[PDB]
Design a protein around this ligand. Structure first.
Ligand SMILES: [Mg+2]
Ligand SMILES: [Mg+2]
Lengths: 277, 277
């Protein structure tokens, strides 16, 4: 299970991988500090371990990369109490984006923006990382265009969503797209039945298998790419399970100090704190 | 005053400038093949048109550049009558994006996507080009952040608008963002009252002044950058005057072989033919 990440050394990006529990610095074998560059190139640079470091756990991960275009996001994509027949709520295939300016990496603060929002909310999500440019993907070739998977927190201003009608602005304020901590390779990861959970200050809020997805990974790839080219390094956020602050009775919104922990089994933890400034 | 453009010569991209309707190759004086790199640099490198070879032959214009993130687009932003504007502005500020993969140059065909849309339509628009990274712009610094202005055709599958609810998909099919033909500098262009016109197969379909804009250029800049960072090379499409094919009695939609001409006085013309591909 090769996992890819970027980590910080001397205020400067380096690249690391993870096979069975330890973190080797692979920058030398792969000849770049851009993990986007590693994906776009569309080959793995014949890296062999038992050669390069094994640095400490307090190493500090960065966002995998700055997406070259807006993060593509799916709307309601999760069934609640599994069954629910062949539906959950309407069932339109809803697509919108998040400006790359909104990306932050692991443990980075989420800017609170109290002047702009009093309904700040979380959404824990499985992210598809596109490895090969293509269009009109089929069930047979879809996964061949996937480099791997990561976590997105689709942070959202529920009031800006209605105020600007289209979701773009309320999802795109600086800080609103935690991304990371690592990319697990397509070969090392089956998205059929993985657990997506969110904790806020330690309280379990979201806990849903990818088996509850109304459109699975292959269907998302198939539908998204119809008449629209996907670029190498595209990030597709595949929706969020039940338990969103807005959907709670009564509704609960994120405040200055709140710590959000999104986890996906096989990938890891993306934790960010809401902080004012 | 110098308008900026990009063109193809022996299959390589080149930078040109247009002065008094004459076109010159300035690639050797700005030392790049990318109009985005010129604007991202953040400063005017002095150009002597005396030493610039004039382009006398027909030349292939390209789109000014591939935007480094999605084109930011404003929804309903035009009044119909000059004084149908008494607090009409007080409508919702609707913001959505178009994928850069939808961009095409002036005189590039628009892919028909017959299999996906039966309601292909047009929107002629003034585009703002951002020159300097910025956030929380003010009426008094906003225009300092603006490199220039250009033209966008916000080609729209009205049926995909309704089907996917959020406009992204219906506005982002390959071929749906005609961009160009040139960028006029902020120095040399006042958007307060310039005429926007669209013709389909020669027949006038839109004709409106930027004086009918519900929110003007400076207001758009103030409201879009509120808690969201703008990047140099950001393109903001500022909305479309009355006369779109969806809003006509009876409704009219674009077919194989339709030619659309979009005109903005002081910029030029964007002519694209819809073609089954
Ligand atoms: Mg979401
Ligand atoms: Mg438009």
């Amino acid at each position: 299970s090769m996992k890819w990440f970027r980590f910080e050394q001397d205020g400067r990006a380096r690249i690391g991988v993870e096979e069975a529990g330890h973190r080797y610095d692979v920058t030398p074998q792969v000849y770049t500090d851009s993990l986007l560059e590693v994906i776009v190139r569309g080959f793995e640079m014949d890296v062999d371990l038992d050669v390069a470091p094994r640095l400490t756990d307090h190493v500090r991960l960065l966002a995998p990369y700055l997406p070259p275009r807006n993060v593509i996001c799916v709307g309601k994509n999760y069934a609640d109490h599994i069954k629910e027949m062949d539906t959950a709520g309407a069932g339109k295939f809803v697509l919108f984006t998040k400006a790359p300016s909104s990306i932050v990496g692991p443990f980075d603060p989420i800017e609170r923006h109290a002047d702009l929002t009093q309904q700040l909310d979380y959404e824990g999500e499985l992210a598809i990382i596109i490895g090969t440019t293509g269009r009109d993907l089929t069930p047979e070739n879809a996964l061949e265009h996937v480099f791997g998977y990561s976590i997105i927190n689709d942070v959202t201003a529920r009031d800006l969503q209605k105020e600007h009608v289209q979701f773009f602005r309320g999802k795109s304020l600086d800080g609103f797209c935690p991304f990371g901590p690592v990319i697990v390779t397509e070969d090392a990861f089956d998205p059929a039945d993985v657990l997506v959970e969110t904790r806020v200050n330690g309280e379990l809020r979201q806990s849903g298998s990818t088996k509850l997805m109304l459109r699975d990974v292959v269907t998302i790839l198939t539908e998204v790419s119809r008449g629209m080219t996907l670029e190498a390094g595209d990030v597709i956020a595949t929706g969020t399970p039940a338990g969103v602050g807005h959907g709670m009775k009564p509704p609960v919104y994120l405040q200055d100090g709140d710590v959000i922990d999104v986890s996906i089994e096989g990938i890891g933890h993306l934790q960010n704190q809401v902080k004012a400034r």
